[PDB]
Amino acid sequence: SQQVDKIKASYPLFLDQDYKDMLAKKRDGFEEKYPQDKIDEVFQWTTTKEYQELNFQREALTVNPAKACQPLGAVLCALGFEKTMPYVHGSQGCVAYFRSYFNRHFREPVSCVSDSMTEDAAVFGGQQNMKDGLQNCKATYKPDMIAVSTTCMAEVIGDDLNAFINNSKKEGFIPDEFPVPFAHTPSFVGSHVTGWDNMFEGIARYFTLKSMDDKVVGSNKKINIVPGFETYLGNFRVIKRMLSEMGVGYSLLSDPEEVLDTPADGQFRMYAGGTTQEEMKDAPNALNTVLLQPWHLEKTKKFVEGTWKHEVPKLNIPMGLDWTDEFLMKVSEISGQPIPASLTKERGRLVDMMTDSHTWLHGKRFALWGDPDFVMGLVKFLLELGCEPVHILCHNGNKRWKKAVDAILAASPYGKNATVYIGKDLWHLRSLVFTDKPDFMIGNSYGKFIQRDTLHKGKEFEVPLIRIGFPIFDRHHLHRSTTLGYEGAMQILTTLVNSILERLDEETRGMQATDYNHDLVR
Amino acid sequence: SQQVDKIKASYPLFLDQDYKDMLAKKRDGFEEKYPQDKIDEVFQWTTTKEYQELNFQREALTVNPAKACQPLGAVLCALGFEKTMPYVHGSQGCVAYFRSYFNRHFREPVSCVSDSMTEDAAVFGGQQNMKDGLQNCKATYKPDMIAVSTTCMAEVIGDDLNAFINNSKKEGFIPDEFPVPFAHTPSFVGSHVTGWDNMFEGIARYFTLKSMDDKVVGSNKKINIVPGFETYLGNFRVIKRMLSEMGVGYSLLSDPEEVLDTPADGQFRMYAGGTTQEEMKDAPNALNTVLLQPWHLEKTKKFVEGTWKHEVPKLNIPMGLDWTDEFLMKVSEISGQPIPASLTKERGRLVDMMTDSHTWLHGKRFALWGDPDFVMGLVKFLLELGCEPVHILCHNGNKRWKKAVDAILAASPYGKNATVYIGKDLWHLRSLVFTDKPDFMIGNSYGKFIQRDTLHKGKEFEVPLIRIGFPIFDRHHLHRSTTLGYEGAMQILTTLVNSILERLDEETRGMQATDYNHDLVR
Amino acid sequence: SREEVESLIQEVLEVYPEKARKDRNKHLAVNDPAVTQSKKCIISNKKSQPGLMTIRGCAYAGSKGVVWGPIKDMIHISHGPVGCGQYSRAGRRNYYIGTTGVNAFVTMNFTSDFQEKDIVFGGDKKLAKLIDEVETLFPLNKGISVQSECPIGLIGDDIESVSKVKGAELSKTIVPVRCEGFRGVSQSLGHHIANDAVRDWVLGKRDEDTTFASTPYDVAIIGDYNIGGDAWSSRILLEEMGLRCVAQWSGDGSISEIELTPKVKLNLVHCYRSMNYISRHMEEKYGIPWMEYNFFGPTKTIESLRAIAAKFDESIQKKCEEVIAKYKPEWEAVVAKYRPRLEGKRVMLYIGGLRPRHVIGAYEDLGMEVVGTGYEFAHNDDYDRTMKEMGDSTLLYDDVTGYEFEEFVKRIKPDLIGSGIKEKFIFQKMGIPFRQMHSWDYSGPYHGFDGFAIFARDMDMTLNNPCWKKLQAPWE
Amino acid sequence: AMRQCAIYGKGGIGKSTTTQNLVAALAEMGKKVMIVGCDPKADSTRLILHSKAQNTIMEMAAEAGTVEDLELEDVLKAGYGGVKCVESGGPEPGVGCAGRGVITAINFLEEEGAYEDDLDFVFYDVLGDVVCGGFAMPIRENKAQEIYIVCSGEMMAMYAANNISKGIVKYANSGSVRLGGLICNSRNTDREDELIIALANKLGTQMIHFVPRDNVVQRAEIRRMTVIEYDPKAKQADEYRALARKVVDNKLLVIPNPITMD
């Protein structure tokens, strides 16, 4: 039933007595469902130390992973260049998924094509699909550039991207000077951050490999910035703002900030802004190249050190105070510009915030996950705050990264109770937050399922989710946030101390029971 | 008892059984406390329509007001001027409170003096305190300027600030040229916003009244901006950023953003930034003067229209989409500068956010309160979002303003269920949220006790507090936010839609009851 | 108009190379409600032209995302690299009642997460080991499906063998599904491979069993995936009408309901496209008749209730007329409130395989007109059903391209578009009101009388929203 | 400076034998040579390394977890004459995907810089039936630039040379990869050398050398050695030196023209 003045959607509609009664009959009659008694006992068992031991013996099964595959990163990379169409050579199912995935995170259109390789293209190869596809795409959507990556099936069968594209050009499907950079992006290797590294390297090699002869390092007086797989619009914007503020000439290579934030003004723009082809061609002339997220830009770094001959600085991701400081001094060192009074003041305003909030953050325990550089940046900042990371999970992490993060942890009194996990998923993490309960989780939307689980055990075991990372599908416009630099650090500090205060108020909102500590002033 | 490894503060310590027992004995033995039965019965009665009728018949009793008194606004005004010491002539109890109130909201030092009028100065006048105080203040704290306001007692006994200051100067306690503007700020008239209007008009009168002879309107080619009582740092900044973006020469009169956000770098800066004495002297040469919060800058408006002869534009507070637009076009008409592409795009990004979040914002019902201009800005935006204001309260509001807002409400389908209240307090609003339950409250920290009350009645009756306004004492660093312009509207849009999604997740987090609607993607 | 629309078709097609032009021309038509053989006017279910930004998915999405995934008390393994399973995790809102991770698993992502060694050496050993860990960590699971991603089908892993061997060792139904993404041309073949697997590995488990107590009023709901609770909202009407719903395929579905479906008297098929396969098979093997119904809006629902009740005795027909009389004042008030706000409005639709024709009824009940519609992957028998439901000189498109759909809308200028998440943000930026017609924009149900109320409210809230008048800056 | 060559030919024709005997002579001439085996049975370096070279690339990756964890030191060994050997590895018959194993191994060698010591020649030994893209990995751009096709006078061997040449064309047109010649590994058929010269002519290439059938080759193979190492004075041993000298001096690199069977 519906009262026309107050229509109910699925919640709370299905709580009406007639639906509830109907669902009771469904279950009893046809579901052959395990008794509630058993379900509760099984549930309780999965929260124990013994279930954790079994759970951590897994060797073949993955449950709720915290990563996606390579071409997702390639697509994001390709999106960052002017009038560029991401083009994924292989099965079209993948593209439908990549677009949907980014649509939901960005609440924006996401442009990308497939060349629709079917069963006969599986056994004969995708040479024809690549010919017809490059021609059709150029004609219909008119990009300046098409950036080609691969699905897993094109990789199993070894479709030679370089040859397929050269024959397309040789046979007149697209003009020879029409730029078609490529990168093999196999999904069964690494993860989506690895796909970003691979795609960027293809494009950079495409524009600079032939013509190294006339390049002189330092001759355009600018600093190359490579951001890596990045999904906070504010992150592109803050790097650009701090460099402009210092007077540093800079060149952001892969810049999707504009095209992922177009205005609603009556027209759809498939393309907007981004790194130009001329900027890439000119990149080897820069003073140096800074990699924002080095732990997934290793292939890019070898090409840039080897072919461009830049002394790429050893910098951590510029998150939190020390590493933002370190980033700014090194940009200062490369370019000759001193650090302006305006950035120095901003630094002291983040310090002021740390001093103001330290009593509430101190000793607070967090479980967290995400991509390698993000996680280590977030871990470093939690330590600078007097917080205790407890469970650090990075599913797409490696042994060397794990070694670096264990060193940061051990350098501080606040890391004594923390352990780093690589190769482990969100079902592992779920066990950890039941057996060794932290105060909060910091991760993406997928963590809401953990929070629901911890709550089902009991309100005193509930571990709230703090949404920082990618993808965030169940809040709106968090993709406009910042995590880098001083600006990112202020936002994170504010998100953290206020999650802490929001939770405390909930635990103290009980009339004449807990509200003696329901303070007006915190 | 305490575990040395996991120490408990007041919460949850006193939930230990021995404290619980000790409290049970205290009550029973010595409190002569009404039986729980009666307490529950009176409580239920305070949630009904009949109590509301009694509650709304009040004529003499005020409960939980939503305003402060004039000198607080006067102090905030003076703080916004270069090296200026706010000076409140009267009782020192007032000053200890003013600083505290601002300390807790801004989490910054707040400098202001009293001249400590005691019982004998009550009966003999505050002439002597004023002589010694100005001399002592000037010598010890060395401001460039001293801005004198009054406590309620100095107003009752008619202490003539003008006379007392001149006799201070004639007798050499402070130098004759040393700037000492003043304003009578009685706490039994209007409130803290009226105090700001009074202070600003006194300072402006001080620097420009004698010398109107040599002023020509429009000759410095700048637009004067008067912010009014504003407690979001970001609001001063967004106005400064948008004018600069347009190339409009501007002069912001009363600018405390710097002094309220000094860096923690090893030294205390009693003063920083602010409107210079030269800016004030030069103000009448500006093209025109824009008042950001007209509904409490009426005294200022008469002085500037009467004496400076600026044709002050008829502008609403620039909040939400229409009135930000309206503000930008008027600044464009006055200065001659076009509206730049970067602002046009900023507008389309706010529109884009509104199209993206509209299905969740639609039909949501809000109770809200705060200052006159803030409230109406907030009401106008909710209507632009498709939301339904229901209870609009403004305790320090007046009958004309009430009419202005009822007209705005009537201009939209979404205002048909709203009522505006002036003169009514937070104990009145509490009845309103029990008898005609909205989905959320938008207000300041004082609202957390209302939420505590609605929850004690029942989880289905709980009305969550969304903290936007002044003062905010129970979250950290919200005073860095923005509420004006496109940037302000984006922050407000994001807070509202995510408060809605956060609450829905809470209502659907129940394992095997409501979590069928605990969706990953919202 | 008929000629004007034909002209619009020829102009749009001018941008394509000749091969893509000759083909895309076959998939765009000007409707004739008189035509009953759609082959004559349009062709469908062909492979997409490379590089043209089709909105189509793959066989795996069709099988795992759509048919299998909703079955709540089985564990569905995304077999292969980590991407597929991760982009589809809780993306489709197939609602279910259960204790997730204990006795129910719908929102969870199970995968074998192929690395390079698993590609080169094959993954049958890992798959076997994977099933042991599952049975350890989720002992209340009542069966397991193995959903092959692209590379499982290339390298020739023997998942049937692993399923027979491990299933015997554990006395557990394990269903191997070859829903390799490169198979077919879209989601459609995945439905089919999903239905044949249900048939081959589950539907027959109780062929010899006669313990279940059957009545002449037993029916199954086939082809409702309970989006936002659509199926729960349908089920209630059928039962108030005195029918007993033994099964729901596959929204809120259990493996036991599927095994008990052969005991019903009539199969109620909502989504024809995705489950007409198993319905024909159940008629051939068990003698069970099946019929298509539509519970979108009052007119279609009322007509469907009467048609279904006519398959039984007069008692059920009596109860039919009761249910109708009960909800009559409720759907009439919805009409009185929302139709005046929607009358005369024009909508263009583009969805998968059922809704582009199925929901036309609900729109008309609010006085709206469907001026254009098309499918991602229908077959010609869907377009046979479609053309009488559309008006004359309306536009029909199949596997429409991003470009084509963009340009059609520019000319036709509808007031509302109802399509998917990939379409959404394109058209909002154009100032055109947009409703998601897969996910229902996280709202719904829209099925039945209770859904229609949410349906009316959603179409009006969006189309008449104050945000749509704000797209142009006053100064330009 | 560096020359990369890929050896193709009909299954069972003598590629791995011919390749290894050539490289032996090449090393004996003072060349720095690497052999890259691209066959799941991993027999391509078995005669340069006596008895064992236990460690294939895929094997070590499977054991080590991932290819990225694997260091160059683990899979590349030196045998007779300082000849460097590495094997792709792959699955046993009938399971997994040997093609992808080749892609991964060749990609590993590139990423780890295996090509940049001071090498004169790189030889890729590929299996007979080239069933997929993986097994053309050695003839992509920046891999082998010279291809030699092993054949003989019988109908089937020549038919195969022609079909491998068609598979080459797409890699030859779009790249720099070129056919170097046909090497005739005799089966003692009538007027066989003339016959292979004729075939070479129709393709657009030459027959670089006629290698006689001599059972010392198999006798040395049974000893896990090249003829060069097993018996340096034998007639067959001088044959591989002649073949070796000619490959050093070859300048003929063509795009072949495949014929229609008539």
Ligand SMILES: Nc1ncnc2c1ncn2[C@@H]1O[C@H](COP(=O)(O)OP(=O)(O)CP(=O)(O)O)[C@@H](O)[C@H]1O
């Ligand atoms: N010139 C020659 N005279 C006599 N026997 C020879 C010979 N060349 C090769 N053989 C023998 O023929 C057999 C095949 O040699 P080899 O293994 O090198 O062929 P191949 O590599 O083409 C097979 P595949 O295609 O499966 O890799 C071996 O036993 C080898 O000793």
Ligand code: ICS
């Ligand atoms: S199953 Fe089909 S695309 Fe019949 S694959 Fe698709 S939940 Fe659509 S038009 Mo998404 S044939 Fe269902 C469908 Fe229709 S996923 Fe849903 S909305 S009625």
Ligand code: CLF
């Ligand atoms: S010593 Fe007097 S009793 Fe003490 S705090 Fe001061 S007034 Fe009160 Fe003042 S704060 Fe404003 S100006 Fe009057 S109302 Fe009140």
Ligand code: CLF
């Ligand atoms: S048609 Fe999968 S998303 Fe792809 S690159 Fe492979 S991991 Fe990543 Fe369908 S079954 Fe899946 S989604 Fe495609 S791969 Fe195929």
Ligand SMILES: [Fe+2]
């Ligand atoms: Fe958007």
Ligand SMILES: [Fe+2]
């Ligand atoms: Fe502070």
Ligand SMILES: [Mg+2]
């Ligand atoms: Mg061989």
